[PDB]
């Protein structure tokens, strides 16, 4: 069968599929390198496979929409680590100390009437 | 085959006068592809709250417009004759055609 695990981060939604095969990655029907596996998050995608050996052990096919570079990136990171419950909840405990388990609840702060943007306050006159 | 888009400003009223229809289908007729939600259109308006000056003022309003889909598959003279005249619940736009 398959081992699913959604996972998301800031407007981004990334679904991960885990099957035991090889250290290749099928993100949006293209290579890890064919997307952003070298940019401002070269390997935040590989991370979930740090203390949980890989190299060529298990293979994974991933889709993702919304957000931008590092957002989709982190999203996937999370989704992987969640689909990675497959082996057991025995590893999803030191994966915690890695922080990969936590949904980064940080969102774009809204703009607010009276301000130039979110927090930024229209400079006011001397006195 | 028979598709009805529902809309109104009260959610816990639209899905109610919707379940009226779904049940009134899977009682008489049959099939029906459930109550599909769809996306809500929220048109917001923001206006100044002071009659003179003060722009930091302002009040922010919105009008949420919720939808439902319906979609009944077996047009049975009995169910198609059930929808009609047993419609009620005003303040709900219903559309059957295209």
């Amino acid at each position: 069968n398959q081992y699913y695990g959604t996972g998301r981060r800031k407007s981004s939604a990334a679904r991960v599929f885990i099957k035991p095969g090889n250290g290749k990655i099928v993100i949006n029907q293209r290579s890890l390198e064919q997307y952003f596996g070298r940019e401002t998050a070269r390997m935040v995608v590989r991370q979930p496979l740090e203390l949980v050996d890989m190299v060529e052990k298990l293979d994974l096919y991933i889709t993702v929409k919304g957000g931008g570079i590092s957002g989709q990136a982190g999203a996937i990171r999370h989704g992987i680590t969640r689909a990675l419950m497959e082996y057991d909840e025995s590893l999803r405990s030191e994966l915690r100390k890695a922080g990969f388990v936590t949904r980064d609840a940080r969102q774009v702060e809204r703009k607010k009437v009276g301000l130039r943007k979110a927090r930024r306050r229209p400079q006011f006159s001397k006195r | 085959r028979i598709r009805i888009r529902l809309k109104a400003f009260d959610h816990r009223l639209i899905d109610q006068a919707t379940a009226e229809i779904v049940e009134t289908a899977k009682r008489t007729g049959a099939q029906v592809r459930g109550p599909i939600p769809l996306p809500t259109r929220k048109e917001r308006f923001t206006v100044l709250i002071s009659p003179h000056v003060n722009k930091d003022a302002r009040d922010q309003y919105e009008i949420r417009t919720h939808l439902r889909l319906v979609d009944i598959v077996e047009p049975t003279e009995k169910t198609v004759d059930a929808l009609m005249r047993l419609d009620l619940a005003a303040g709900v736009d219903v559309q059957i055609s295209l």
Partner: protein
């Protein structure tokens, strides 16, 4: 907002349709690539107030021509003054 200046807009809104959209239609095809007989952009000497771009848009209830809104046909004041009393269906103070 000053009766007179109000009736003016009614006369304008009337003219807008007595003539324009009607006999004014003859300028769309009349005065564009259909080639010239000049009496074309000439007959454009009708009332004056006879034109949509000459209407203003006034708070349907007061007349205040500022702070207006297309959805409701009113200006921010009376719009809120009504919104806070039901009056405007579906409309309530939002947040997010």
């Amino acid at each position: 907002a000053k009766q007179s200046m109000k009736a003016r807009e009614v006369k304008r809104v009337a003219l807008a349709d007595k003539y324009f959209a009607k006999r004014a239609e003859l300028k769309a095809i009349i005065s564009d690539v259909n080639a010239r007989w000049n009496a074309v952009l000439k007959l454009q000497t009708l009332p004056r107030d006879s034109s949509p771009s000459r209407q203003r848009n006034r708070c349907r209830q007061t007349g205040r021509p500022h702070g207006f809104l297309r959805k409701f046909g009113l200006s921010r004041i009376k719009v809120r003054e009504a919104a806070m009393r039901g009056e405007i269906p579906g409309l309530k103070k939002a947040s997010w």
